[PDB]
């Protein structure tokens, strides 16, 4: 028919549908999730890369102002330092007594590192999860992974899984996010080329090859030390010096919902975070027809040990008197209880690992189409 559930989605659960219709033997589904992750479509814009000084020869004018036109450097501060006394080594740059001078440009340029390592203000957009859930559908066992927001039919052998809509706003999501070498940040970006001088993320990075730099990391120059060829500039601190070097806590650590984030594409792979909601359009034309099942009678279940909370829980011995053989399902009608298994045998005392959290067990269990009422107390 339908199978319309929700599967508790903190994968690694084994998720039980105990469905059963009309002319079939009861219907067993067990679910098991994998990776739905989010995946939040990004918007970079940043570079996150170092600044770099064109500081070139300093057009000496001895004697004489040199004038200094504008370059081409993205912080192509010339100044014509006059009253330069150049005494150098090898060759008189001055031969006057005044007038002589150095006019010294500097221009603000990208990193040769950015083609090594970027840094990405990547603004968020919605994400959607996708997810593997080992499926079994009675003897089909298949682990289906598809887009889990629900709008992906999920094509299933016989089967269409649709997982999602789900409600999921507990996301790795920010307003930006910073990814810098795989480390994650939720971290405030600041308006595309309008950075303070050593702000973390100073280079305008509009495009990863891009044409132009914002940046208030700003060289300062001045009239330099006489002789020695000094054009000193006093440049800005490196803030991807210190958004990096120096950065906080990442954003990949410190996961809200218990969540693994990782970034090929940022995505929060092992999610612990509510349940997956489900639509098994699967019909009774996969599942045994009722008129060759093992007519189970005298159902009697036994209490063999109670656990309070271990995986397995609870010896119970199921007894019972079957019409033939054939598979027995499991699929009891408690949320109290978790079956070990949807497998059962052919007929006698089915020992099974009674699975409940609950301490005062009382489990109405499923077997065969038929059904009985295990009570027990579990451990501590």
């Known amino acids: ?86 005494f150098m080594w090898g060759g008189a740059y001055c031969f006057c007594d005044s007038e002589n001078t150095q006019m010294s440009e500097a221009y603000v340029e990208r990193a040769d590192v950015c083609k090594h390592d970027h840094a990405a203000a990547y603004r968020a957009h919605t994400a959607s999860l996708r997810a593997k859930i080992k499926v079994t559908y009675g003897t089909v066992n298949q682990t289906v992974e598809a887009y889990v927001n629900g709008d992906h039919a999920v094509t299933i052998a016989g089967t269409k899984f649709i997982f999602g809509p789900v409600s999921t706003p507990w996301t790795p999501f920010d307003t930006k996010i910073l990814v810098y070498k795989g480390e994650l940040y939720n971290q405030d970006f600041p308006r595309y080329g309008a950075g303070q001088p050593g702000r973390f993320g100073d280079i305008q990075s509009r495009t990863l090859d891009s044409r132009d730099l914002y940046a208030n990391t700003g060289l300062k120059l001045a009239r330099p030390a006489a002789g020695n060829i000094h054009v000193p500039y006093t440049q800005t601190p490196s803030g991807f010096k210190t958004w990096q070097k120096d950065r906080d806590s990442p954003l990949n650590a410190k996961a809200p919902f218990g969540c693994i984030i990782q970034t090929n594409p940022v995505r929060a792979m092992n999610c612990a975070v509510g349940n997956i909601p489900v639509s098994m359009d699967i019909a009774d034309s996969a599942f045994t027809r009722l008129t060759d099942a093992p007519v189970i009678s005298e159902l009697t279940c036994t209490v063999s040990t109670c656990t309070h909370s271990s995986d397995f829980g609870g010896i119970a011995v199921l007894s019972y008197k079957v019409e033939k053989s054939g598979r027995c399902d499991i699929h009891s009608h408690s949320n109290v209880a978790v079956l070990q298994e949807v497998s059962i045998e052919t007929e006698g005392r089915s020992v099974i690992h009674f699975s409940t959290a609950s301490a005062s067990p009382s489990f109405v269990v499923s077997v065969c189409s038929s059904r009985a009422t295990c009570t027990a107390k579990c451990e501590p």
């Open 1 to 86: 028919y339908e199978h319309t559930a929700i599967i508790p989605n903190q994968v690694g659960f084994p998720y039980k549908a105990h469905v059963a219709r009309e002319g079939y033997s009861p219907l067993t589904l067990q679910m098991q999730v994998i990776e739905t992750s989010l995946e939040p479509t990004l918007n970079l814009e940043y570079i996150t890369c170092d600044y770099k000084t064109k500081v070139p020869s300093p057009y000496v004018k001895c004697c004489g102002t040199a004038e200094c036109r504008t370059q081409d450097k993205p912080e192509y501060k010339c100044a014509v330092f006059t009253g330069v006394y150049p």
